[PDB]
Coordinates of N, CA and C in Angstrom, one line a residue:
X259 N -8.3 -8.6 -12.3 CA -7.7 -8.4 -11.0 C -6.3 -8.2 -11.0
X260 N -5.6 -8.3 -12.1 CA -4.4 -8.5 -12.4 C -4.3 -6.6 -12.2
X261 N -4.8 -6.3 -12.5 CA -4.6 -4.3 -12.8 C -4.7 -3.9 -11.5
X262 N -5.7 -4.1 -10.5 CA -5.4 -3.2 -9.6 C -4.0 -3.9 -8.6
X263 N -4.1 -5.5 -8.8 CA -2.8 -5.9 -8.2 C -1.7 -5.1 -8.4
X264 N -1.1 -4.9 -9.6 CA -0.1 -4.4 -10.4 C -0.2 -2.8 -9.5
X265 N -1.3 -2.2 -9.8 CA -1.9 -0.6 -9.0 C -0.8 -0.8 -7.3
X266 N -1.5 -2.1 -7.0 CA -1.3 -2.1 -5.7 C -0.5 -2.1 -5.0
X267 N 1.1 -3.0 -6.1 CA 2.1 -3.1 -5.9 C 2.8 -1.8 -6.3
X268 N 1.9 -1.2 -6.9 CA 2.8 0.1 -7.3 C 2.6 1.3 -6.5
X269 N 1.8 0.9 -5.3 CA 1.2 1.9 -4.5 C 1.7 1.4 -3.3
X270 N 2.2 0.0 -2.9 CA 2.9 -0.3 -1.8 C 4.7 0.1 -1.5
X271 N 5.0 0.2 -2.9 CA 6.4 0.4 -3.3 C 6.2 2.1 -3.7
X272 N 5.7 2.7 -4.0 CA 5.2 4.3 -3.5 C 6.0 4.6 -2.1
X273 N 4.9 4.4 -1.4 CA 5.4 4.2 -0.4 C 6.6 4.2 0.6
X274 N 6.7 3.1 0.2 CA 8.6 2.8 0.3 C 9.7 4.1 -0.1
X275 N 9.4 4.4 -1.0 CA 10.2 5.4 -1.9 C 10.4 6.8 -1.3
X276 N 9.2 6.3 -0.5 CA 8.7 8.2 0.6 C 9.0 8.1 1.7
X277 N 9.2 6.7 2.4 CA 9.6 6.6 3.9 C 11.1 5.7 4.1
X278 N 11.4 5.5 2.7 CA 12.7 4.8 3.5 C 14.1 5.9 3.2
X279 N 15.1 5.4 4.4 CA 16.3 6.0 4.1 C 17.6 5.4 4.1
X280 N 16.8 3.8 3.5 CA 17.6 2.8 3.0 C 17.9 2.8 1.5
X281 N 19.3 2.9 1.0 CA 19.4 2.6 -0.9 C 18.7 1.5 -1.1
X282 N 19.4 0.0 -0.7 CA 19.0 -1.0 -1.3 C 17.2 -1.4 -1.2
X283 N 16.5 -0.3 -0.2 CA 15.6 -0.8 0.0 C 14.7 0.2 -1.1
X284 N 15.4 1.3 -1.2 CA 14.7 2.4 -2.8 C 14.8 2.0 -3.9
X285 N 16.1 1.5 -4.2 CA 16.6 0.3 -5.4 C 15.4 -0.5 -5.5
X286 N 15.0 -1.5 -4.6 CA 14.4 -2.8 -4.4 C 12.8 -2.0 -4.2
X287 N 12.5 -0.9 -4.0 CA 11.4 -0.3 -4.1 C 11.0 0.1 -5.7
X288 N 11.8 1.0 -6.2 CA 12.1 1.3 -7.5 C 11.8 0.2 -9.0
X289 N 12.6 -0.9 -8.6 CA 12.7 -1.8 -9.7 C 11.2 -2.5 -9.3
X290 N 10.8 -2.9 -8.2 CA 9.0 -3.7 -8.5 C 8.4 -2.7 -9.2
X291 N 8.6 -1.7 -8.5 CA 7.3 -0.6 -9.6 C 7.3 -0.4 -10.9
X292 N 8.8 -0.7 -11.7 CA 8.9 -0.7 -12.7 C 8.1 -1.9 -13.6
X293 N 8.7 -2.8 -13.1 CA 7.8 -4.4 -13.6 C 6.5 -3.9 -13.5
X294 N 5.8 -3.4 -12.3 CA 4.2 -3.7 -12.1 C 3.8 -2.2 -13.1
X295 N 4.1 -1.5 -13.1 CA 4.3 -0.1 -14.3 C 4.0 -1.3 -15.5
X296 N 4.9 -1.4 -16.3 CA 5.3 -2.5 -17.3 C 3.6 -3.2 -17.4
X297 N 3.8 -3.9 -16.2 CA 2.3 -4.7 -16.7 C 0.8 -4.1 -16.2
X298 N 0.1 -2.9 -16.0 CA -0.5 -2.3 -16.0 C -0.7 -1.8 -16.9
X299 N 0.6 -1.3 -18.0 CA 0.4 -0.7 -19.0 C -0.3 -1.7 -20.1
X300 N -0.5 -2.8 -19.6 CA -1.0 -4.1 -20.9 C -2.5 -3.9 -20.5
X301 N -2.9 -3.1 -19.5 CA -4.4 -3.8 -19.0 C -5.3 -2.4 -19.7
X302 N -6.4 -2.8 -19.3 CA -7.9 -2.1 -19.4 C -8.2 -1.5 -18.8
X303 N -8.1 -0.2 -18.0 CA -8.8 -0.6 -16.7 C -10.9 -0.1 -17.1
X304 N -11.0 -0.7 -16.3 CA -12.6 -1.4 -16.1 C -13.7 0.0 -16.9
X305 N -13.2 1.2 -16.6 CA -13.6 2.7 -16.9 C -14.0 2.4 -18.2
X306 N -13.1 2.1 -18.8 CA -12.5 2.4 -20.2 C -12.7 1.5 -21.1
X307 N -13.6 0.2 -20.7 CA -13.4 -1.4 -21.5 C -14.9 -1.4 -22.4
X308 N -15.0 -0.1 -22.5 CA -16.6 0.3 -23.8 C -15.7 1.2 -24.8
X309 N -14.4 1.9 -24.2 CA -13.5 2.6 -25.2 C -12.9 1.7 -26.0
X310 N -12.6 2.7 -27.7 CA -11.8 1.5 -28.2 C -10.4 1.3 -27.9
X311 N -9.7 0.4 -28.1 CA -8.4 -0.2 -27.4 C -7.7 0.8 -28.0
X312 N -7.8 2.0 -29.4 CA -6.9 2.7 -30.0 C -7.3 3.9 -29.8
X313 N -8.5 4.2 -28.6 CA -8.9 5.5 -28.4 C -7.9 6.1 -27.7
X314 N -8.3 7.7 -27.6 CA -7.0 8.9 -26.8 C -7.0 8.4 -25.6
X315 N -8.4 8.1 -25.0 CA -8.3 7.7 -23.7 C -7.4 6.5 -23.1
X316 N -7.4 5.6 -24.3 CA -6.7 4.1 -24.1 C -5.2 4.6 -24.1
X317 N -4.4 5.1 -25.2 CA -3.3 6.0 -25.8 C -2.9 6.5 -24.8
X318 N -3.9 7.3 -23.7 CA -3.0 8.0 -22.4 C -3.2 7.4 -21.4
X319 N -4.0 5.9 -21.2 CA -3.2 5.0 -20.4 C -2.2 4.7 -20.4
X320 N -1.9 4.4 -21.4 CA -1.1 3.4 -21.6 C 0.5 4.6 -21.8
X321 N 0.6 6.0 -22.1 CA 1.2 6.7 -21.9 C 2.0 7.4 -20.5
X322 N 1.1 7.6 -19.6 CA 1.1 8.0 -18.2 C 2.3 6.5 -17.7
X323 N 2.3 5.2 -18.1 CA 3.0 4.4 -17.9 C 4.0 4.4 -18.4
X324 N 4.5 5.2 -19.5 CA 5.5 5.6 -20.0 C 6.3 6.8 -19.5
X325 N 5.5 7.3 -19.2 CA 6.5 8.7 -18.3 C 6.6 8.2 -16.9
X326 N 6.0 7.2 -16.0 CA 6.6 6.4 -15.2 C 7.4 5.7 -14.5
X327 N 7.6 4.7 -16.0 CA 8.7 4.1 -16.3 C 9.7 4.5 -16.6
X328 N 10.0 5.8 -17.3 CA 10.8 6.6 -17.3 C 11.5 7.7 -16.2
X329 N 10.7 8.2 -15.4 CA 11.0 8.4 -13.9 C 11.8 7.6 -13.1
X330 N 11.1 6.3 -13.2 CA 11.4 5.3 -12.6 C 12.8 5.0 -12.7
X331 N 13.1 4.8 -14.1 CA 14.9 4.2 -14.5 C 15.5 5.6 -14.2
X332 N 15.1 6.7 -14.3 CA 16.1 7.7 -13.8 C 16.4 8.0 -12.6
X333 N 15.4 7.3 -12.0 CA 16.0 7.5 -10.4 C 17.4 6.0 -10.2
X334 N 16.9 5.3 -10.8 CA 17.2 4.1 -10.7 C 18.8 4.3 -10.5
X335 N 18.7 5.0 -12.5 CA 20.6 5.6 -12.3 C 21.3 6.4 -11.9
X336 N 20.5 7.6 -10.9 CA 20.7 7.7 -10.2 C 21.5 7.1 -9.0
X337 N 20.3 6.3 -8.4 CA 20.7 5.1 -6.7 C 21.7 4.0 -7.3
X338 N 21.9 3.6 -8.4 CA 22.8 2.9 -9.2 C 24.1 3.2 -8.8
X339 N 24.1 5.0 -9.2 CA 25.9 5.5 -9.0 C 26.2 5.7 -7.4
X340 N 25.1 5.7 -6.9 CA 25.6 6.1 -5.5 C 24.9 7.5 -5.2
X341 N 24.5 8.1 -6.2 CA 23.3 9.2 -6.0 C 22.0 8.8 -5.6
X342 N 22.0 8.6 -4.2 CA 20.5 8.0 -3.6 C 19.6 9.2 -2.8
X343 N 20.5 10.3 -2.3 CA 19.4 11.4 -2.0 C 19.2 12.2 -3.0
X344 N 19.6 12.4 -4.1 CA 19.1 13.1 -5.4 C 18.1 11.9 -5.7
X345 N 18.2 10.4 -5.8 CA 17.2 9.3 -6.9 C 15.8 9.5 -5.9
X346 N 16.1 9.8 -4.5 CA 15.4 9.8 -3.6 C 13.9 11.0 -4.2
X347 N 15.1 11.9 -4.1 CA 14.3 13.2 -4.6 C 13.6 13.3 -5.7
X348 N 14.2 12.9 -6.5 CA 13.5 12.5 -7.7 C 12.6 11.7 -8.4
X349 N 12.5 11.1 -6.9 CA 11.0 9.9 -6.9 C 10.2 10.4 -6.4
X350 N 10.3 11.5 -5.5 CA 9.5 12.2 -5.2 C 8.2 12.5 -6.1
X351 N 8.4 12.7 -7.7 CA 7.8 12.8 -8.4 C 6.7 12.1 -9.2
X352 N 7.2 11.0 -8.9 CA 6.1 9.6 -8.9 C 4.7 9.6 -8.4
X353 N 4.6 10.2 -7.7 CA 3.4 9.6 -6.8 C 2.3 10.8 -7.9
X354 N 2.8 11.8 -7.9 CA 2.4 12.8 -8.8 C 1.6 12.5 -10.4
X355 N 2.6 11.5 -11.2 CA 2.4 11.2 -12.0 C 1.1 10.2 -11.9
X356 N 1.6 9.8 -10.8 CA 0.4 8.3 -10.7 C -0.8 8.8 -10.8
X357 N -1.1 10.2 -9.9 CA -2.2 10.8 -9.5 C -2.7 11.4 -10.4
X358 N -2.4 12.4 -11.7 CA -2.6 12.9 -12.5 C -3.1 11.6 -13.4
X359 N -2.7 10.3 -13.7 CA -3.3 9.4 -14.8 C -4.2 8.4 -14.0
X360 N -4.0 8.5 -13.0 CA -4.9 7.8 -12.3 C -6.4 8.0 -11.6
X361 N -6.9 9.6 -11.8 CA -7.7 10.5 -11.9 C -8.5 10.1 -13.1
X362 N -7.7 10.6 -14.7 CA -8.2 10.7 -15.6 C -9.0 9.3 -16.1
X363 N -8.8 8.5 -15.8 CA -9.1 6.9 -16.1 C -10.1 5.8 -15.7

């Protein structure tokens, strides 16, 4: 239950990232989904729990969380310097990513 929580939090802070036109609240949007990113990336999801733990399928779970995560902190430093409608913009791209590994899985 822990995985789609993690999904959930990362789908409620989505969200966030698309409708606000608050920094500290894209910041504070941004950093949960990184954490719940982070621990998603440790799970199974349910699809997949007859694959082996080292198959391609598993490998691009657990990858798709890595390009993510990485999104993620570049927006971050971004909203960090005070560039929050470019970190903005560039979150834009998240939801994207999610969709494309969240399809395959």
């Amino acid at each position: 239950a822990d995985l789609e929580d993690n999904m959930d939090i990362l789908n409620d802070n989505l969200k966030v990232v698309e409708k606000t036109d608050s920094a500290p609240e894209l910041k504070a949007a941004l950093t949960k989904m990184r954490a719940a990113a982070l621990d998603a990336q440790k799970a199974t999801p349910p699809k997949l729990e007859d694959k082996a733990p080292d198959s391609p399928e598993m490998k691009d779970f657990r990858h798709g969380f890595d390009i993510l995560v990485g999104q993620i902190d570049g927006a971050l430093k971004l909203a960090n310097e005070g560039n929050v409608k470019e970190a903005k913009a560039a979150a834009e791209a998240l939801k994207t990513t999610r969709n494309t590994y969240h399809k395959k899985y």
